[PDB]
Amino acid sequence: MGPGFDFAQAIMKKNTVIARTEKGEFTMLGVYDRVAVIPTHASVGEIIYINDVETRVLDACALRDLTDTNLEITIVKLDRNQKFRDIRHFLPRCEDDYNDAVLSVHTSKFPNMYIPVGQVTNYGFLNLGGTPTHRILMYNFPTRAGQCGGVVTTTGKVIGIHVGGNGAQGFAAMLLHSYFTD
């Protein structure tokens, strides 16, 4: 409808796949080469389905901060025959608050879904499903089941991936440029 949705659509069309684990179907953001991200609660194993194709996982790392606190981001390297467009220059360098964000989802259940979530707060600490979690972003939308892994963008930045909600608020794990230096 406007330039927020335009940036979100550009990311979804080239940089997302549908990931399936034993814990469900997730929106999965491809960042560069064969490297993608997914919520840690997807419990990625040795094999994952990518757009319904059996795919070997070459590496999977559940990120934690230097206090050994969960960040809820898993970085996955996929044994895929094709690279993602490199979008690392759209990742923030620092923790921040944002205006006018869009949450975008692409699954069998929710195809081509875009939600204008508005203002995004650097919330910080969240007890997420009983697990102490850091670097949480918060937005005021009744976010449901089937949204996990959804991409949070502003015009020009890819800032997080949806990891939960409490019925009134939704929560995303930050993406930072420093996670994807090689």
Short mmCIF file of N, CA, C and O in Angstrom, two decimals, residues 47-181:
data_model
loop_
_atom_site.label_atom_id
_atom_site.label_comp_id
_atom_site.label_asym_id
_atom_site.label_seq_id
_atom_site.Cartn_x
_atom_site.Cartn_y
_atom_site.Cartn_z
N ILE A 47 18.41 -32.52 9.63
CA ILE A 47 17.61 -32.44 8.38
C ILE A 47 16.45 -31.48 8.63
O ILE A 47 15.86 -31.52 9.74
N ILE A 48 16.16 -30.63 7.64
CA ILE A 48 15.03 -29.67 7.67
C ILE A 48 14.35 -29.72 6.29
O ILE A 48 15.02 -30.09 5.31
N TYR A 49 13.08 -29.34 6.20
CA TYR A 49 12.40 -29.22 4.89
C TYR A 49 12.40 -27.73 4.54
O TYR A 49 12.02 -26.90 5.38
N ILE A 50 12.82 -27.41 3.32
CA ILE A 50 12.91 -26.02 2.80
C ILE A 50 12.01 -26.00 1.56
O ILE A 50 12.34 -26.70 0.57
N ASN A 51 10.87 -25.30 1.63
CA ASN A 51 9.90 -25.31 0.50
C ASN A 51 9.59 -26.77 0.13
O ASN A 51 9.56 -27.08 -1.09
N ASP A 52 9.37 -27.62 1.13
CA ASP A 52 8.97 -29.06 1.04
C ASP A 52 10.05 -29.93 0.39
O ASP A 52 9.73 -31.03 -0.06
N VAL A 53 11.30 -29.51 0.42
CA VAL A 53 12.43 -30.32 -0.09
C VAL A 53 13.35 -30.69 1.09
O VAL A 53 13.79 -29.78 1.83
N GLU A 54 13.63 -31.98 1.21
CA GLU A 54 14.55 -32.51 2.25
C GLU A 54 15.94 -31.90 2.07
O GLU A 54 16.49 -32.02 0.96
N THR A 55 16.46 -31.24 3.11
CA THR A 55 17.70 -30.43 3.05
C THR A 55 18.59 -30.75 4.26
O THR A 55 18.15 -30.66 5.41
N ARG A 56 19.84 -31.11 4.03
CA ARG A 56 20.81 -31.33 5.11
C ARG A 56 21.16 -29.99 5.74
O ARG A 56 21.30 -28.99 4.99
N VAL A 57 21.22 -29.96 7.06
CA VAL A 57 21.71 -28.79 7.83
C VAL A 57 23.22 -28.95 7.98
O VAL A 57 23.64 -29.91 8.68
N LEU A 58 24.00 -28.02 7.42
CA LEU A 58 25.49 -28.10 7.51
C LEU A 58 25.98 -27.57 8.85
O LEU A 58 27.06 -28.05 9.28
N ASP A 59 25.27 -26.64 9.47
CA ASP A 59 25.63 -26.04 10.77
C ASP A 59 24.39 -25.38 11.35
O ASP A 59 23.56 -24.83 10.56
N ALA A 60 24.24 -25.41 12.66
CA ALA A 60 23.14 -24.69 13.33
C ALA A 60 23.63 -24.20 14.69
O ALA A 60 24.20 -25.01 15.46
N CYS A 61 23.48 -22.91 14.95
CA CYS A 61 24.01 -22.31 16.20
C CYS A 61 22.90 -21.48 16.87
O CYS A 61 22.41 -20.46 16.26
N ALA A 62 22.48 -21.92 18.06
CA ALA A 62 21.53 -21.18 18.92
C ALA A 62 22.27 -20.07 19.64
O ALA A 62 23.17 -20.38 20.54
N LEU A 63 21.99 -18.84 19.29
CA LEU A 63 22.77 -17.70 19.81
C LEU A 63 22.38 -17.42 21.26
O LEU A 63 21.20 -17.50 21.61
N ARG A 64 23.38 -17.01 22.05
CA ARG A 64 23.18 -16.53 23.44
C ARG A 64 24.05 -15.29 23.60
O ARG A 64 25.06 -15.22 22.88
N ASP A 65 23.67 -14.35 24.45
CA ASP A 65 24.54 -13.19 24.71
C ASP A 65 25.71 -13.60 25.63
O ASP A 65 25.87 -14.80 25.98
N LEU A 66 26.59 -12.64 25.91
CA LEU A 66 27.84 -12.93 26.66
C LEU A 66 27.53 -13.10 28.15
O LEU A 66 28.46 -13.53 28.84
N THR A 67 26.32 -12.83 28.61
CA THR A 67 25.83 -13.30 29.95
C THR A 67 25.29 -14.75 29.87
O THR A 67 24.84 -15.26 30.92
N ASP A 68 25.40 -15.44 28.73
CA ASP A 68 24.88 -16.82 28.52
C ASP A 68 23.36 -16.75 28.70
O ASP A 68 22.79 -17.68 29.31
N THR A 69 22.71 -15.69 28.19
CA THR A 69 21.23 -15.57 28.14
C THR A 69 20.72 -15.86 26.71
O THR A 69 21.30 -15.35 25.74
N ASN A 70 19.69 -16.69 26.60
CA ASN A 70 19.01 -17.00 25.32
C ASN A 70 18.78 -15.70 24.51
O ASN A 70 18.24 -14.71 25.05
N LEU A 71 19.06 -15.71 23.19
CA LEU A 71 18.59 -14.65 22.26
C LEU A 71 17.43 -15.12 21.35
O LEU A 71 16.85 -14.27 20.65
N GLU A 72 17.14 -16.42 21.30
CA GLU A 72 16.00 -17.03 20.56
C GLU A 72 16.24 -17.01 19.05
O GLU A 72 15.29 -17.33 18.31
N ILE A 73 17.46 -16.71 18.60
CA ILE A 73 17.83 -16.77 17.16
C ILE A 73 18.70 -18.02 16.97
O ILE A 73 19.76 -18.13 17.70
N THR A 74 18.35 -18.87 16.01
CA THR A 74 19.27 -19.92 15.51
C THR A 74 19.72 -19.54 14.10
O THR A 74 18.90 -19.29 13.25
N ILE A 75 21.03 -19.58 13.87
CA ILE A 75 21.64 -19.36 12.54
C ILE A 75 21.85 -20.73 11.96
O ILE A 75 22.50 -21.59 12.60
N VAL A 76 21.31 -20.93 10.76
CA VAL A 76 21.37 -22.24 10.07
C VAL A 76 22.12 -22.08 8.76
O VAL A 76 21.81 -21.10 8.03
N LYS A 77 23.09 -22.95 8.49
CA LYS A 77 23.66 -23.06 7.13
C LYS A 77 23.04 -24.27 6.43
O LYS A 77 23.15 -25.40 6.98
N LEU A 78 22.44 -24.06 5.26
CA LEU A 78 21.66 -25.07 4.53
C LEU A 78 22.48 -25.67 3.38
O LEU A 78 23.20 -24.90 2.68
N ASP A 79 22.40 -26.98 3.18
CA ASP A 79 23.02 -27.65 2.00
C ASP A 79 22.12 -27.47 0.77
O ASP A 79 21.50 -28.42 0.30
N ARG A 80 21.99 -26.22 0.36
CA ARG A 80 21.12 -25.77 -0.76
C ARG A 80 22.00 -25.47 -1.97
O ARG A 80 23.16 -25.02 -1.79
N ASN A 81 21.47 -25.64 -3.18
CA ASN A 81 22.22 -25.45 -4.44
C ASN A 81 22.16 -24.00 -4.91
O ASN A 81 22.61 -23.72 -6.02
N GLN A 82 21.67 -23.08 -4.09
CA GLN A 82 21.47 -21.69 -4.52
C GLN A 82 21.72 -20.77 -3.33
O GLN A 82 21.41 -21.17 -2.20
N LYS A 83 22.31 -19.60 -3.57
CA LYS A 83 22.57 -18.58 -2.53
C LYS A 83 21.40 -17.60 -2.43
O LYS A 83 20.70 -17.32 -3.45
N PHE A 84 21.23 -17.03 -1.24
CA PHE A 84 20.32 -15.89 -0.99
C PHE A 84 21.01 -14.62 -1.48
O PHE A 84 22.26 -14.43 -1.27
N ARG A 85 20.21 -13.70 -1.98
CA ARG A 85 20.65 -12.29 -2.10
C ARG A 85 21.25 -11.85 -0.76
O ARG A 85 20.61 -12.08 0.29
N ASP A 86 22.39 -11.20 -0.77
CA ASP A 86 23.05 -10.70 0.45
C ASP A 86 22.31 -9.45 0.93
O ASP A 86 22.34 -8.39 0.22
N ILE A 87 21.65 -9.54 2.09
CA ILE A 87 20.88 -8.41 2.71
C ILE A 87 21.55 -7.94 4.01
O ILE A 87 20.89 -7.21 4.81
N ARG A 88 22.80 -8.30 4.26
CA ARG A 88 23.44 -7.90 5.54
C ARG A 88 23.53 -6.38 5.68
O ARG A 88 23.50 -5.89 6.79
N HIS A 89 23.61 -5.60 4.58
CA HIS A 89 23.66 -4.12 4.68
C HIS A 89 22.32 -3.52 5.11
O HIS A 89 22.28 -2.29 5.37
N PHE A 90 21.25 -4.31 5.24
CA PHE A 90 19.96 -3.81 5.77
C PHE A 90 19.82 -4.10 7.28
O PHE A 90 18.76 -3.77 7.86
N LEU A 91 20.82 -4.73 7.90
CA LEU A 91 20.73 -5.10 9.34
C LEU A 91 21.26 -3.94 10.18
O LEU A 91 22.33 -3.39 9.91
N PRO A 92 20.55 -3.60 11.27
CA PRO A 92 21.04 -2.60 12.22
C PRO A 92 22.36 -3.02 12.88
O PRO A 92 22.63 -4.23 13.08
N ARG A 93 23.18 -2.04 13.23
CA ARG A 93 24.43 -2.33 13.96
C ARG A 93 24.19 -2.37 15.48
O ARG A 93 24.92 -3.11 16.18
N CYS A 94 23.21 -1.63 16.00
CA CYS A 94 22.99 -1.46 17.46
C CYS A 94 21.52 -1.74 17.83
O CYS A 94 20.65 -1.67 16.94
N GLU A 95 21.28 -2.02 19.12
CA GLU A 95 19.93 -2.15 19.70
C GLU A 95 19.23 -0.78 19.57
O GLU A 95 19.89 0.26 19.80
N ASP A 96 17.95 -0.75 19.22
CA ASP A 96 17.26 0.52 18.99
C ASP A 96 15.76 0.31 19.07
O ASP A 96 15.31 -0.86 19.11
N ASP A 97 15.04 1.41 19.20
CA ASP A 97 13.58 1.53 19.01
C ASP A 97 13.34 1.98 17.56
O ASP A 97 14.26 2.60 16.93
N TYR A 98 12.15 1.71 17.03
CA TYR A 98 11.78 1.99 15.62
C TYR A 98 10.36 2.52 15.53
O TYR A 98 9.51 2.18 16.31
N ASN A 99 10.10 3.31 14.48
CA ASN A 99 8.70 3.66 14.13
C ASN A 99 8.25 2.88 12.88
O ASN A 99 9.10 2.56 12.00
N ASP A 100 6.95 2.62 12.81
CA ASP A 100 6.24 2.26 11.56
C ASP A 100 6.86 0.97 10.99
O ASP A 100 7.38 0.97 9.85
N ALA A 101 6.82 -0.11 11.75
CA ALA A 101 7.34 -1.43 11.32
C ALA A 101 6.21 -2.28 10.70
O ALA A 101 4.99 -2.04 10.97
N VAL A 102 6.61 -3.23 9.86
CA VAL A 102 5.74 -4.24 9.20
C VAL A 102 6.26 -5.61 9.62
O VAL A 102 7.50 -5.81 9.63
N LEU A 103 5.35 -6.49 9.99
CA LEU A 103 5.64 -7.92 10.23
C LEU A 103 5.10 -8.69 9.03
O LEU A 103 3.88 -8.58 8.75
N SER A 104 5.96 -9.43 8.32
CA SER A 104 5.59 -10.19 7.10
C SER A 104 5.81 -11.70 7.30
O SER A 104 6.90 -12.09 7.78
N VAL A 105 4.82 -12.50 6.90
CA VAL A 105 4.75 -13.96 7.13
C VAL A 105 4.47 -14.62 5.80
O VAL A 105 3.65 -14.10 4.99
N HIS A 106 5.14 -15.73 5.54
CA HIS A 106 4.79 -16.55 4.37
C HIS A 106 4.86 -18.03 4.74
O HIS A 106 5.97 -18.56 4.87
N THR A 107 3.70 -18.65 4.94
CA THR A 107 3.60 -20.10 5.24
C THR A 107 2.44 -20.66 4.41
O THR A 107 1.68 -19.84 3.85
N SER A 108 2.26 -22.00 4.42
CA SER A 108 1.01 -22.66 3.90
C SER A 108 -0.25 -22.04 4.55
O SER A 108 -1.25 -21.81 3.84
N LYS A 109 -0.23 -21.77 5.85
CA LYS A 109 -1.40 -21.26 6.63
C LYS A 109 -1.62 -19.76 6.35
O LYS A 109 -2.80 -19.30 6.28
N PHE A 110 -0.54 -18.99 6.24
CA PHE A 110 -0.61 -17.51 6.06
C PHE A 110 0.28 -17.08 4.89
O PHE A 110 1.38 -16.57 5.12
N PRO A 111 -0.12 -17.30 3.61
CA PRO A 111 0.64 -16.81 2.46
C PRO A 111 0.51 -15.30 2.24
O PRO A 111 -0.57 -14.75 2.50
N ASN A 112 1.63 -14.63 1.87
CA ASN A 112 1.63 -13.22 1.46
C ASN A 112 0.91 -12.38 2.52
O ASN A 112 0.21 -11.45 2.12
N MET A 113 1.23 -12.57 3.80
CA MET A 113 0.62 -11.82 4.92
C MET A 113 1.55 -10.68 5.34
O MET A 113 2.77 -10.95 5.57
N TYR A 114 1.02 -9.46 5.42
CA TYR A 114 1.77 -8.26 5.85
C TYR A 114 0.94 -7.55 6.91
O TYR A 114 -0.19 -7.22 6.61
N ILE A 115 1.52 -7.21 8.05
CA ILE A 115 0.80 -6.57 9.20
C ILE A 115 1.52 -5.29 9.58
O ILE A 115 2.69 -5.33 9.96
N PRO A 116 0.90 -4.09 9.49
CA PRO A 116 1.53 -2.88 9.98
C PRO A 116 1.42 -2.85 11.51
O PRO A 116 0.32 -2.69 12.04
N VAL A 117 2.53 -3.04 12.20
CA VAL A 117 2.50 -3.21 13.69
C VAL A 117 2.76 -1.89 14.39
O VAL A 117 2.49 -1.84 15.58
N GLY A 118 3.23 -0.86 13.69
CA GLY A 118 3.46 0.47 14.24
C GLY A 118 4.75 0.55 15.01
O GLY A 118 5.79 0.03 14.51
N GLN A 119 4.70 1.22 16.16
CA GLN A 119 5.90 1.54 16.98
C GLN A 119 6.50 0.26 17.59
O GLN A 119 5.74 -0.57 18.16
N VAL A 120 7.82 0.16 17.52
CA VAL A 120 8.59 -0.99 18.07
C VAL A 120 9.51 -0.48 19.20
O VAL A 120 10.38 0.39 18.93
N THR A 121 9.33 -1.03 20.41
CA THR A 121 10.08 -0.68 21.63
C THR A 121 11.25 -1.67 21.80
O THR A 121 11.05 -2.89 21.60
N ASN A 122 12.42 -1.15 22.13
CA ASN A 122 13.53 -1.98 22.67
C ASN A 122 13.11 -2.40 24.08
O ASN A 122 13.35 -1.61 25.02
N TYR A 123 12.48 -3.55 24.19
CA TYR A 123 11.86 -4.06 25.45
C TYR A 123 12.96 -4.64 26.35
O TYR A 123 12.93 -4.44 27.59
N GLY A 124 13.89 -5.37 25.74
CA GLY A 124 15.04 -5.98 26.43
C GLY A 124 14.73 -7.36 26.96
O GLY A 124 14.64 -8.35 26.16
N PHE A 125 14.58 -7.47 28.28
CA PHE A 125 14.35 -8.78 28.94
C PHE A 125 12.88 -9.21 28.79
O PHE A 125 11.95 -8.40 28.94
N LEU A 126 12.69 -10.48 28.46
CA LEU A 126 11.37 -11.16 28.41
C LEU A 126 11.56 -12.58 28.91
O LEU A 126 12.46 -13.30 28.47
N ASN A 127 10.66 -12.98 29.80
CA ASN A 127 10.48 -14.42 30.12
C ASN A 127 9.61 -15.04 29.04
O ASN A 127 8.38 -14.87 29.11
N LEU A 128 10.23 -15.65 28.03
CA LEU A 128 9.55 -16.15 26.82
C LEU A 128 9.30 -17.65 26.96
O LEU A 128 10.24 -18.42 26.90
N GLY A 129 8.03 -18.04 27.17
CA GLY A 129 7.70 -19.47 27.41
C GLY A 129 8.49 -20.06 28.58
O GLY A 129 8.87 -21.23 28.49
N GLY A 130 8.76 -19.29 29.63
CA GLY A 130 9.57 -19.74 30.78
C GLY A 130 11.08 -19.53 30.63
O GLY A 130 11.81 -19.83 31.60
N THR A 131 11.57 -19.08 29.47
CA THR A 131 13.03 -18.98 29.20
C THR A 131 13.44 -17.52 29.25
O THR A 131 12.94 -16.72 28.45
N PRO A 132 14.34 -17.09 30.18
CA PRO A 132 14.83 -15.71 30.20
C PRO A 132 15.49 -15.40 28.83
O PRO A 132 16.25 -16.23 28.34
N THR A 133 15.08 -14.30 28.22
CA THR A 133 15.49 -13.95 26.83
C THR A 133 15.88 -12.48 26.81
O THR A 133 15.17 -11.67 27.41
N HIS A 134 16.95 -12.13 26.10
CA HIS A 134 17.40 -10.73 25.95
C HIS A 134 17.20 -10.21 24.51
O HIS A 134 16.87 -11.03 23.60
N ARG A 135 17.37 -8.90 24.33
CA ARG A 135 17.31 -8.21 23.01
C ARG A 135 15.95 -8.41 22.33
O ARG A 135 15.90 -8.59 21.08
N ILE A 136 14.87 -8.35 23.11
CA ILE A 136 13.48 -8.46 22.60
C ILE A 136 12.96 -7.09 22.19
O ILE A 136 13.17 -6.09 22.90
N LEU A 137 12.36 -7.06 21.01
CA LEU A 137 11.59 -5.92 20.47
C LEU A 137 10.11 -6.19 20.74
O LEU A 137 9.63 -7.34 20.64
N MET A 138 9.35 -5.14 21.05
CA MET A 138 7.91 -5.34 21.35
C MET A 138 7.07 -4.40 20.49
O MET A 138 7.47 -3.25 20.30
N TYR A 139 5.92 -4.89 20.02
CA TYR A 139 4.94 -4.13 19.21
C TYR A 139 3.52 -4.51 19.64
O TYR A 139 3.29 -5.64 20.11
N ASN A 140 2.59 -3.57 19.48
CA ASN A 140 1.19 -3.69 19.97
C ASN A 140 0.33 -4.23 18.83
O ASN A 140 -0.33 -3.42 18.14
N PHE A 141 0.34 -5.55 18.64
CA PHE A 141 -0.60 -6.27 17.75
C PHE A 141 -0.95 -7.62 18.38
O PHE A 141 -0.06 -8.30 18.88
N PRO A 142 -2.24 -8.00 18.41
CA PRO A 142 -2.65 -9.36 18.80
C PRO A 142 -2.09 -10.40 17.82
O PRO A 142 -2.83 -10.90 16.97
N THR A 143 -0.80 -10.71 17.96
CA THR A 143 -0.04 -11.69 17.12
C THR A 143 -0.39 -13.11 17.58
O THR A 143 -0.40 -13.36 18.81
N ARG A 144 -0.67 -14.00 16.62
CA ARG A 144 -1.24 -15.36 16.85
C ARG A 144 -0.17 -16.42 16.59
O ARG A 144 0.97 -16.06 16.24
N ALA A 145 -0.55 -17.69 16.77
CA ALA A 145 0.21 -18.88 16.32
C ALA A 145 0.25 -18.87 14.79
O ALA A 145 -0.78 -18.50 14.17
N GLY A 146 1.40 -19.24 14.21
CA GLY A 146 1.65 -19.26 12.76
C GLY A 146 2.44 -18.05 12.29
O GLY A 146 2.72 -17.96 11.08
N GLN A 147 2.83 -17.16 13.21
CA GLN A 147 3.56 -15.91 12.89
C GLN A 147 5.07 -16.08 13.13
O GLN A 147 5.84 -15.20 12.67
N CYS A 148 5.49 -17.16 13.81
CA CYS A 148 6.88 -17.33 14.30
C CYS A 148 7.84 -17.39 13.11
O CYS A 148 7.56 -18.13 12.14
N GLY A 149 8.91 -16.59 13.19
CA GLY A 149 9.90 -16.48 12.11
C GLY A 149 9.55 -15.33 11.17
O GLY A 149 10.37 -15.00 10.30
N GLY A 150 8.36 -14.74 11.35
CA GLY A 150 7.92 -13.61 10.53
C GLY A 150 8.94 -12.49 10.59
O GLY A 150 9.60 -12.30 11.62
N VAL A 151 9.14 -11.79 9.49
CA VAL A 151 10.22 -10.79 9.38
C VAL A 151 9.68 -9.43 9.79
O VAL A 151 8.59 -9.01 9.27
N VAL A 152 10.41 -8.75 10.67
CA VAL A 152 10.08 -7.35 11.08
C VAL A 152 11.01 -6.39 10.35
O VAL A 152 12.23 -6.49 10.49
N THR A 153 10.42 -5.46 9.59
CA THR A 153 11.16 -4.47 8.79
C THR A 153 10.63 -3.07 9.07
O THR A 153 9.46 -2.91 9.43
N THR A 154 11.47 -2.09 8.83
CA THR A 154 11.06 -0.70 8.56
C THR A 154 11.52 -0.39 7.14
O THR A 154 12.33 -1.18 6.59
N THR A 155 11.15 0.77 6.60
CA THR A 155 11.77 1.23 5.33
C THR A 155 13.30 1.23 5.52
O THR A 155 13.84 1.97 6.34
N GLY A 156 13.96 0.35 4.80
CA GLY A 156 15.41 0.32 4.65
C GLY A 156 16.06 -0.61 5.64
O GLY A 156 17.22 -0.76 5.49
N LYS A 157 15.35 -1.14 6.66
CA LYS A 157 16.02 -2.04 7.65
C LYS A 157 15.23 -3.32 7.96
O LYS A 157 14.00 -3.30 8.02
N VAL A 158 15.97 -4.41 8.08
CA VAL A 158 15.46 -5.73 8.56
C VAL A 158 15.90 -5.85 10.02
O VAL A 158 17.13 -5.97 10.27
N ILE A 159 14.95 -5.72 10.97
CA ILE A 159 15.34 -5.44 12.38
C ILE A 159 15.09 -6.66 13.29
O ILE A 159 15.63 -6.63 14.39
N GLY A 160 14.31 -7.66 12.90
CA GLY A 160 14.06 -8.78 13.83
C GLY A 160 13.22 -9.89 13.21
O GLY A 160 12.76 -9.75 12.04
N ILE A 161 13.04 -10.97 13.97
CA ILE A 161 12.17 -12.10 13.58
C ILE A 161 11.22 -12.37 14.76
O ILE A 161 11.65 -12.36 15.94
N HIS A 162 9.93 -12.50 14.46
CA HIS A 162 8.84 -12.72 15.45
C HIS A 162 9.11 -14.03 16.20
O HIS A 162 9.31 -15.06 15.56
N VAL A 163 9.03 -14.01 17.55
CA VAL A 163 9.31 -15.24 18.36
C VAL A 163 8.20 -15.51 19.38
O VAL A 163 8.23 -16.58 19.97
N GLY A 164 7.21 -14.63 19.52
CA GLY A 164 6.13 -14.89 20.50
C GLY A 164 5.15 -13.75 20.67
O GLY A 164 5.29 -12.70 20.05
N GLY A 165 4.22 -13.95 21.60
CA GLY A 165 3.19 -12.95 21.89
C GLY A 165 2.50 -13.27 23.19
O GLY A 165 2.72 -14.40 23.69
N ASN A 166 1.74 -12.32 23.73
CA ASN A 166 0.93 -12.58 24.96
C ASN A 166 -0.57 -12.34 24.71
O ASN A 166 -1.30 -12.14 25.70
N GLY A 167 -1.02 -12.38 23.46
CA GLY A 167 -2.42 -12.11 23.10
C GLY A 167 -2.68 -10.65 22.76
O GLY A 167 -3.63 -10.44 21.97
N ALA A 168 -1.96 -9.69 23.34
CA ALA A 168 -2.11 -8.23 23.09
C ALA A 168 -0.86 -7.62 22.43
O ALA A 168 -0.99 -6.65 21.63
N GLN A 169 0.31 -8.07 22.87
CA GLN A 169 1.64 -7.67 22.33
C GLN A 169 2.30 -8.84 21.59
O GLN A 169 1.99 -10.02 21.84
N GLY A 170 3.13 -8.49 20.61
CA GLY A 170 4.03 -9.43 19.91
C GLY A 170 5.48 -9.07 20.20
O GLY A 170 5.82 -7.91 20.51
N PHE A 171 6.35 -10.06 20.11
CA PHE A 171 7.77 -9.96 20.49
C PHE A 171 8.66 -10.52 19.37
O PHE A 171 8.38 -11.61 18.82
N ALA A 172 9.72 -9.78 19.06
CA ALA A 172 10.68 -10.23 18.05
C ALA A 172 12.07 -10.27 18.68
O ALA A 172 12.39 -9.40 19.49
N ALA A 173 12.90 -11.19 18.23
CA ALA A 173 14.35 -11.20 18.55
C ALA A 173 15.07 -10.25 17.60
O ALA A 173 14.81 -10.32 16.36
N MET A 174 15.94 -9.39 18.12
CA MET A 174 16.72 -8.47 17.27
C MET A 174 17.57 -9.24 16.30
O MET A 174 18.20 -10.26 16.70
N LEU A 175 17.72 -8.70 15.09
CA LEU A 175 18.84 -9.07 14.20
C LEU A 175 19.85 -7.92 14.24
O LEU A 175 19.47 -6.77 14.09
N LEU A 176 21.10 -8.26 14.44
CA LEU A 176 22.23 -7.33 14.43
C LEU A 176 23.23 -7.76 13.36
O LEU A 176 23.47 -8.95 13.16
N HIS A 177 23.83 -6.79 12.70
CA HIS A 177 24.88 -7.02 11.67
C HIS A 177 26.00 -7.94 12.21
O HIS A 177 26.54 -8.81 11.48
N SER A 178 26.39 -7.74 13.47
CA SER A 178 27.50 -8.52 14.10
C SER A 178 27.21 -10.01 14.19
O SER A 178 28.14 -10.77 14.37
N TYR A 179 25.96 -10.47 14.07
CA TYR A 179 25.67 -11.92 14.08
C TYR A 179 26.21 -12.60 12.79
O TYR A 179 26.38 -13.82 12.84
N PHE A 180 26.45 -11.86 11.71
CA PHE A 180 26.61 -12.42 10.33
C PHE A 180 27.90 -11.95 9.64
O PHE A 180 28.00 -12.05 8.39
N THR A 181 28.86 -11.47 10.42
CA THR A 181 30.24 -11.19 9.94
C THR A 181 30.92 -12.55 9.69
O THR A 181 30.66 -13.50 10.48
#
